[PDB]
Amino acid sequence: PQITLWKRPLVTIKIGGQLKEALLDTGADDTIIEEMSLPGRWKPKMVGGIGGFIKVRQYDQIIIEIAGHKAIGTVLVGPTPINIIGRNLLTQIGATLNF
Amino acid sequence: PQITLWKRPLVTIKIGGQLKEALLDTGADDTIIEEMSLPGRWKPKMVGGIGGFIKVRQYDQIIIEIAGHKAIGTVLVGPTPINIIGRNLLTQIGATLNF
Ligand SMILES: CCCC[C@H](CC(O)(O)[C@H](CCCC)NC(=O)[C@@H](NC(=O)[C@@H](NC(C)=O)[C@@H](C)O)[C@@H](C)CC)C(=O)N[C@@H](CCC(N)=O)C(=O)N[C@@H](CCCNC(=N)N)C(N)=O
């Protein structure tokens, strides 16, 4: 699909067996999801942007489905104000910004 | 162009006759630039990012070129970690997300 930018580019994702809405964010290096359980090992990470940093749990090799496109990658979990799909998974679904 | 997301989508912008680097940021409602001088009156705005909220100065109707594309619109100035071109200007330059 072609997603204009008149409104926030929010899509449905499926992660960890759950459906969530998330923002496709070309300004995010990483994908950050609000608190939820994920399987496997995790390590702590600090990520920052406007307003400073939050601490998250980094889970690697997590499968996600973004707007019906499957991918795998690292997912950070923590107190993000909105779920964000960042470039580490946007690449995997073949997302480009075009103008 | 068609910009893939394997690296940050950084572009050159021109504002106030000066070239700067900025990030094309579909996760940003607005465009925020580091401290600089812009003409005219400003209005207060609070914006929220991953880490919390910051205060910025809102300047309207500012001439700005983004990767060679001319826009005229609102630029927030304040303590952003990096200059970000948000949706208010990405729509002016005709940018979409595509996958
Ligand atoms: C949490 C809100 C959605 C996330 C986006 C994030 C982002 O703007 O894409 C910024 C790009 C700016 C780059 C620093 N990216 C980030 O903050 C991401 N940061 C990064 O990718 C890198 N960090 C740095 C400092 O570059 C990396 C080294 O970690 C983090 C998400 C972590 C991966 C964001 O902050 N959007 C703001 C931008 C400010 C603006 N345009 O006004 C927004 O639209 N805010 C809306 C409301 C959103 C709610 N926020 C909140 N705290 N409730 C608003 N204020 O009007």
UniProtKB/TrEMBL annotation, chains A, B:
Q: Where is the Peptidase A2 domain?
A: 20-89
| Protein topology in the membrane | Lipid-anchor
Give a GO cellular-component term. Answer: virion membrane
Q: Which GO terms describe its biological process?
A: proteolysis
The record ties this protein, via CDD domains, to: HIV_retropepsin_like
Q: Enumerate the GO terms in the molecular function aspect.
A: aspartic-type endopeptidase activity
Alphabetized, the UniProt keywords read: Aspartyl protease, Host endosome, Hydrolase, Protease
Protein name listed in UniProt = Protease
Lineage of source species:
Viruses, Riboviria, Pararnavirae, Artverviricota, Revtraviricetes
